[PDB]
């Protein structure tokens, strides 16, 4: 959903700092593909959507994990491929994705930093954050910020003005000390960005499943 606010900048040096935890995700359907995005968070895991995971059609191995993706022909950190879809219980669009080690039998989060995770105990309405990922009007696999602020934290839903396109899907949502808030899922034309807002009850389900996490 593109807003007012679309203040998006592409990254170039992916594999540093906190962009590295920042995932392109690419899944053939016939026809094509689906591509979109997600954030590591755990020796063999991402979080991403519900929506992106769904488009394996219940084969985890139809989906290639590209963490600090740059583009299409630079893919700095290889690839992960899916091995366990674990959907997230509750009423929002998030799935931990497990992926196996790759060629060279690394994990995920021994090739990049696993992101840390927000408690979310400081987060509130007007506050900046960023949404980092693939979006898909950009060229396949290249990595882009956009800077917002959040507008409305309602239970499972955070919501930003800041800007998105599909491909977004999946995207974390960082705060200023670079920890993830949220994974964006969608939007609504004309009005904000949707997001999952890691709750307390969002944490047991990370905790319970990723023994690992880092939550801060």
Known sequence: VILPNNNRHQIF???????????????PIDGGYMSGSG??????EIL???????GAKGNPRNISVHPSAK????????????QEIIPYPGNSDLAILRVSPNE???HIGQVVKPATIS????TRINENITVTGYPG????????????KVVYIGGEELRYDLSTVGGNSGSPVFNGKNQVIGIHYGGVDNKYN??????????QFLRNNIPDINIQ
Do not use: C, R
């Open 48 to 54: 991403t959507n519900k929506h992106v995971v769904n």
């Open 194 to 203: 949707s997001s999952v807002y890691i709750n307390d009850f969002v944490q």
């Open 119 to 122: 408690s979310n105990t400081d």
């Open 71 to 82: 583009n299409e022909n630079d893919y700095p950190n290889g690839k992960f491929v899916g």
């Open 13 to 27: 040096n992916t594999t540093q700092g906190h962009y590295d935890a920042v995932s392109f995700i690419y899944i």
């Open 39 to 44: 954030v590591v968070v755990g020796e063999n």
């Open 104 to 106: 060279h039998n690394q």
């Open 137 to 148: 009007d950009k060229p396949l696999a290249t990595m882009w910020e956009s800077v917002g």
